[PDB]
Design a protein around this ligand. Structure first.
Ligand code: ZN
Ligand code: ZN
Length: 1350
């Protein structure tokens, strides 16, 4: 079992300083730590602690005596020796000193294997991309126009990735991490022998232990100790540095950033050595300085350089805070730090926000983390009553207006106070729109307005909320169980009290193993006030991982009942009250969100092609808002929400419970300093305790706070008589103040006028925020006439800045997920490469990088085996033949390979048929020479796998090939099944059944075993049926690492299952060895397929032979979709050129036009008019009866019936067959089912954070016209063609290029192509099989509704 629950490969936990201190002091390791540094650990009785844990102490003593023997000088005390013991933050400038190059062969073998494999496919990939450019533009310089400098191929990429700086460091820390993970795994199994590893490299001695490593560098005479989390963090940071430096070296776009990033890294490493853990304040100041430098180019003189100067002052304060540097040294350091950000384009100035994670993370202490929140929270705060009531009145107005525009424009049930004026009387009587200008006046009457019950909201409305695992704290009596037993044993022995019981329960497991669960009775915990009277309640903080800022270093955890009430209340707020606010543009659809943000940023840019429209953008972060929320400023809003929802007392729970409870920071190695503090309630407001908190907690009750902030923003906007559009995000907000200026004014003067108009709004907003208790400092406020910040992305002058280096920094050598398969890692690398394509990096370079890192990952997995195997035949066969490695890496993942990035994926996110794209890629590789035609013949002639009807129906477009599903998803499904099997919750009484797989197989066979097989129709019908609903509910579980471990423990895997999960990688490699080794003998009729055959025909034939066992010769219809690159034969027209396809026969094309004279980040009058580009089209029914408030079951049944009738026929027998599959989810009869069913024609057949598809730099000025074309598959095809054309236009002028001196026209002639085929459907398809006996959860509300109509 321990071979699956391997130690994590990447950092996921905070670095605890006291853990390392505990390990160092346990074995009496040499150190120069002051008594103040040790904190509470100095007064611990280490004799007893060493008496226990004797294996740990024995290992530590062994490494100590090895250190003494190797370095005799370490015995000297009082720091009179020449060797200095350094803790993690002070070893940054000496990371390159640790080499271990000798007595280390695995990294060298890995590098040699990667080079040998890459050397075989570089030219083929160059030919592939050349052919792609020739086919998509008609010219061979599509990808090389912006660079022509130097074109990096795959071999060049490998050379500059393995030969640059940090490469040796990455190899030596990868070996160290691998050895330490091996030692940890051995220790878990109880081997107890040879658990100390010594490498003893010349000038660098490293000793590896399952607990910590001891690294000594002779060149610098510095010895350091690193725990496992520290080692993971160091190797992750080194890998990120390697990726960033190599990408800067490779891409011409990021070339200027290389030297600046290197100089910044060196400067901050020296600063870290000189300072300690206080250099991460400087790192955060640099994070803010990126935006300060962005604001330095603002046209307005009054707003240019303010943030720059403030951030410089903050950096100087941080530098001179502890008197490490004098004024002149701090000034020189500041100048050196700032000189790396000057003379950079706005895109690059935002791609220096990648270096935040490049210096690791600070060593956290519970006391320091608690100090910040205790300073912010638990503080007196004076609040303005008038501001509170004005905000409440505008809250009422916004809620009323949001209830209007829906519900037939009818006012909610409201009660008017006695001093409402006649105008309010008539407006309530009339039910007209409450004008904000009207609400500003008579605010005393708009307030004191009781809004009665509006929604019949039910806590159990959403089921997915209850299925998400959340951390839950121990009761108030076991609050000391979080700390290590060794540290608290002496305290509990002195006090003569029993040791606290460790707490390991989870919220998800408590919910699932709850016999009597009901949200109606669960909310009574808060409604009846039992939470205030609960003595067991205990809320505690815990250190947050991968956090460098002082704020947000802790996240809180609460008891099971309180957490359940919190999630129920948040869901209640978001479902009904949250939807009423449309003043902010937040939507659950990302496409609409980015369109709204693009329009908001493009408000200010108006071209010459009266009074124009001008915008000034204001962005403020709300991270510190949670600690500053007070009960008095939220009581009226929450009271009105209570009245609206009908629950007498549901909200205001966080503050009321917090003022009566004592909070603490729970860290296993950070016990309270005072050994006499054995109880939480009587603790003092110091150390790790936060006595009587009066503020909020981050994330908790975020919806109410966001609505209050929206009301405040609206109030401020109306107070200054300025038009704004808010976009509050919870942790951030962006405001665009709108004003009307003269058209003839110069752009600088229009911006000045906009800023002058926005000054009053900003003053009113600051005054209102101060009134409600949120003081706005210069840190929070960034005023810019060009850009605003949303979702950590900068919207600069109608674009979105790239930040591709931030994406490339997290491209590591192994997925942190459980299975750790080669396929999962390759998929992660491909996803990161897709992000790089979207974020401005060269598409050709991204393709080469994806191939190179796929090869590198496979070589790493081959030469760094996670689990030792008795038979190494497969591993040796792959290691000795790099051509096999190349063939496997270049083969698409749909055919069994590890190439998860298709050629067409480089241009459009949406892919119709993955198999067609895979076939097109294989044909391209065969034409270039990367692969061989006999590989394609072997794939065509491959023996069908062990597939059933269920796998064909559940996941269409997939061939019958074994080992296409990684062991990771198998582990996730096993965890979900184990959770379902032991579940006893009433809400899931009938979800789980033992014959679920049999029922799914029978239904899939019924839907598929017909005259014509329709995998999409079967997939949709299965998903919308009862069994599909049960599968969805079972898949609602999160299946985290803890959940997977619990499932493996309570339900152990069989020996055969254990072995196959362990050796999935070797089994997959051996399975693909049958096709990537030698030309197999295939059937003679397969020779008809050639490299010139259309990918659609090849895909149809491959699906026919692959599923030959299941179908016995029947063809598969409804899946094929043209490959976007192969479908279109584009031509680019520059100046006097003409389209060859237009002049020769073809007359179908998608017209793309780019005007001339465009210059980004320049005068808006000069360039052609700007507009929101085409980012995509989502779902957008004419049913006989428009049922309002229809349940999910009713909609699912209606869609199932419609799809069945549309696909299998409109005969009465088909209607009876679909009646059963509809009645498995509703209680309709045939007549109501037929009447209520939507129109059964043109079935969509569609079924299954902020990542924009592009920067939209040059796609905003483009002109499109699809008039000369035919025009829901055709709509998807045309949308894909449009997106591909936009991507082609964008890559024609890469982010290195910012001007277009000539007008360009793109045609993308989709005609005269073999992939265009007529679409035929709606034929008669008799069932051919009796309808299976389906068990339906009649009593379950979330699957079946006995009353689907009112
Ligand atoms: Zn043309
Ligand atoms: Zn074709």
């Amino acid at each position: 079992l321990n071979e699956i629950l391997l130690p994590e490969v990447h950092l996921n936990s905070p670095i605890v300083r006291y853990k390392l201190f505990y390990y160092i002091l346990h074995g009496q390791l040499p150190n120069d730590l002051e008594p103040d540094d040790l904190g509470p650990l100095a007064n611990q009785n280490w004799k007893a602690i060493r008496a226990e844990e004797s294996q740990v102490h024995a290992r530590l003593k062994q490494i100590r005596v090895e250190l003494i023997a190797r370095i005799p000088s370490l015995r000297w005390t009082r720091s009179q020796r020449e060797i200095a013991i350094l803790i993690w933050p002070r070893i940054l400038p000496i990371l390159q000193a640790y080499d271990l190059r000798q007595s280390m062969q695995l990294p060298t073998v890995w590098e040699k294997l990667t080079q040998s494999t890459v050397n075989l496919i570089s030219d083929g990939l160059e030919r592939v991309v050349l052919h792609i450019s020739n086919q998509l533009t008609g010219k061979p310089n599509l990808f090389t126009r912006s660079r022509a400098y130097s074109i990096p191929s795959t071999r060049e990429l490998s050379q500059i990735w393995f030969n640059n700086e940090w490469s040796g460091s990455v190899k030596t820390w990868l070996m160290i991490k691998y050895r330490m993970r091996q030692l940890i795994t051995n220790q878990k199994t109880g081997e107890l022998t040879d658990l100390v590893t010594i490498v003893d490299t010349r000038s660098t001695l490293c000793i590896i232990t399952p607990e910590l490593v001891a690294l000594y560098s002779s060149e610098h005479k510095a010895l350091t100790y690193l725990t496992f989390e520290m080692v993971l963090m160091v190797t992750d940071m080194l890998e990120g540095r390697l990726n960033v430096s190599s990408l800067c070296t490779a891409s011409h776009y990021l070339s200027p950033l290389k030297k600046r990033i290197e100089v910044l890294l060196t400067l901050v490493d020296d600063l870290a050595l000189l300072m300690g853990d206080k250099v991460y304040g400087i790192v955060s100041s640099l994070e803010s300085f990126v935006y300060a430098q962005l604001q330095y180019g603002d046209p307005v003189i009054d707003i240019k350089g303010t943030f720059y100067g403030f951030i410089c002052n903050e950096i100087l304060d941080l530098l001179t805070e502890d008197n490490i540097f004098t004024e002149e040294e701090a000034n020189k350091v500041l100048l050196d730090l700032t000189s790396q950000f000057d003379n950079l384009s706005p895109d690059l100035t935002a791609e220096l926000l990648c270096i935040m994670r490049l210096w690791g993370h600070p060593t956290l202490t519970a006391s320091q983390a608690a100090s910040k929140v205790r300073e912010s929270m638990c503080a007196p705060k004076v609040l303005d009553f008038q501001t509170i009531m004005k905000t409440l009145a505008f809250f009422h107005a916004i809620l009323i207006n949001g209830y209007r525009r829906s519900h037939n424009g009818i006012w909610p049930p409201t009660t008017l106070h006695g001093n409402a004026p006649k105008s309010l009387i008539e407006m309530r009587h009339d039910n007209s729109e409450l004008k904000y200008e009207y609400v500003l006046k008579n605010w005393k009457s708009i307030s004191m307005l009781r809004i009665h019950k509006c929604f019949d909201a039910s806590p159990d409305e959403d089921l997915s909320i209850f299925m998400k695992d959340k951390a839950i704290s121990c009761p108030r009596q076991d609050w000391m169980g979080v700390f290590r037993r060794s540290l608290i044993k002496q305290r509990y022995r002195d006090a003569n009290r029993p040791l606290p019981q460790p707490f390991n329960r989870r919220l998800l497991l408590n919910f699932l193993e709850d016999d009597r669960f009901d949200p109606i009775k669960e909310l009574e915990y808060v409604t009846s006030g039992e939470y205030l009277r609960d003595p067991e309640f205990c809320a505690s903080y815990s250190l947050k991982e991968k956090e460098i800022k002082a704020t947000g270093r802790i996240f809180a955890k609460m008891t099971k009942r309180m957490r359940s009430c919190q999630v129920i209340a948040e869901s209640l707020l978001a479902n009904h009250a949250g939807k009423l606010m449309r003043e902010n543009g937040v939507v659950l659809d990302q496409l609409k969100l980015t369109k709204s943000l693009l329009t908001m940023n493009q408000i200010g840019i108006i071209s010459e092609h009266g009074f124009e429209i001008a915008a000034c953008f204001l962005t403020t972060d709300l991270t510190k808002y949670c600690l500053n929320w007070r009960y008095q400023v939220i009581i009226p809003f929450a009271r009105t929400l209570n009245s609206m929802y009908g629950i007498p007392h549901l909200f205001e729970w966080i503050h009321l419970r917090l003022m009566r409870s004592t909070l603490y920071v729970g860290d296993p190695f950070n016990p309270p300093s005072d050994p006499t503090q054995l109880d939480l309630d009587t603790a003092l407001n110091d150390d790790i305790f936060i006595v009587s908190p009066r503020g909020g907690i981050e994330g908790l009750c975020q919806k109410l706070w966001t609505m209050i902030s929206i009301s405040t923003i609206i109030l401020s906007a109306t107070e200054a008589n300025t038009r704004v559009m808010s976009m509050v995000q919870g942790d951030n907000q962006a405001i665009a103040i709108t004003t009307r200026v003269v058209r003839s004014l110069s752009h600088s003067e229009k911006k000045e006028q906009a800023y002058k108009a926005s000054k009053l709004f900003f003053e009113r907003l600051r005054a209102n925020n101060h009134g409600i208790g949120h003081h706005l400092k210069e840190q929070e406020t960034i005023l810019s006439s060009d850009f605003f910040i949303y979702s950590k992305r900068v919207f600069y002058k109608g674009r979105i800045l790239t930040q591709a280096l931030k994406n490339v920094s997290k491209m590591c050598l192994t997925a942190d997920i459980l299975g750790d398969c080669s396929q999962a890692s390759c998929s992660n690398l491909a996803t990161t490469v897709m992000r790089l394509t979207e974020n401005g990096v060269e598409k050709d370079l991204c393709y080469f990088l994806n191939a190179f890192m796929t090869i590198r990952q496979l070589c790493y997995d081959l030469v760094f085996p996670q689990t030792k195997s008795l038979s190494q035949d497969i591993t040796n066969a792959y290691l000795n033949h790099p051509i096999l490695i190349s063939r496997l890496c270049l083969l698409p993942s749909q055919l069994g390979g590890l190439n998860f990035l298709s050629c067409s994926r480089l241009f459009n996110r949406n892919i119709g048929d993955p198999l067609v794209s895979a076939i097109a890629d294989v044909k391209r590789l065969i034409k270039a020479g990367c692969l061989d035609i006999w590989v394609l013949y072997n794939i065509l002639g491959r023996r069908p796998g062990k597939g059933k009807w269920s796998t064909l129906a559940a996941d269409p477009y997939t061939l019958n090939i074994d080992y296409l599903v990684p062991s990771t998803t198998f582990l996730k499904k096993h965890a979900q099944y184990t959770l379902m099997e032991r579940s006893v919750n009433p809400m899931l009484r009938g979800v789980f059944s033992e014959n679920a797989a049999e029922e799914e197989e029978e239904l899939a066979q019924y839907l598929l075993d017909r005259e014509v097989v329709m995998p999409r129709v079967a997939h949709v019908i299965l998903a919308q049926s009862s069994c599909g609903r049960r599968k969805q509910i079972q898949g609602y579980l999160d299946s985290t690492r803890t959940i997977i471990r619990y499932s493996l423990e309570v339900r152990p895997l069989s020996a055969k299952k254990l072995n196959t999960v362990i050796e999935y990688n070797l089994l997959y490699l051996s399975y693909n060895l049958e096709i990537i080794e030698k030309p197999n003998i295939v059937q003679p009729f397969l020779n008809a397929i050639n490299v010139d055959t259309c990918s659609i025909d090849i895909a149809r034939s491959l699906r026919k032979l692959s599923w030959a066992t299941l179908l016995n010769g029947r063809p598969i219809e409804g899946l094929e979709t043209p490959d976007p690159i192969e479908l279109v034969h584009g031509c680019l027209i520059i100046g006097s050129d003409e389209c060859e396809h237009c002049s020769s026969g073809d007359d179908k094309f998608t017209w793309f036009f780019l005007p001339k004279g465009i210059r980004l980040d320049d005068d808006p009058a000069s360039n052609p008019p700007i507009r929101v580009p085409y980012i995509g089209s989502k779902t957008d029914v004419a049913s006989m009866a428009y049922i309002k408030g229809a349940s999910v079951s009713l909609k699912s049944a209606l869609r199932l019936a419609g799809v069945y009738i549309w696909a299998f026929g409109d005969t009465e027998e088909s209607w009876q067959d679909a009646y059963e599959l509809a009645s498995t989810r509703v209680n309709l009869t045939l007549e109501q089912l037929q009447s209520l069913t939507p129109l059964p024609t043109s079935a969509n057949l569609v079924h299954r954070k902020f990542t924009p598809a592009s920067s939209y730099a040059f796609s905003s000025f483009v002109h499109i016209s699809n008039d000369c074309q035919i025009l829901t598959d055709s709509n998807l095809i045309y949308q894909q063609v449009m997106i591909t054309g936009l991507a082609l236009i964008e890559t024609w002028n890469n982010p290195p290029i910012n001007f277009s001196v000539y007008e360009t026209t793109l045609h993308l002639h989709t005609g005269s192509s073999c992939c265009i085929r007529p679409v035929e459907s709606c034929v008669v398809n008799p069932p051919l099989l009796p309808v299976p006996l389906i068990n339906v959860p009649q009593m379950n509300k979330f699957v079946y509704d006995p009353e689907p109509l009112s």
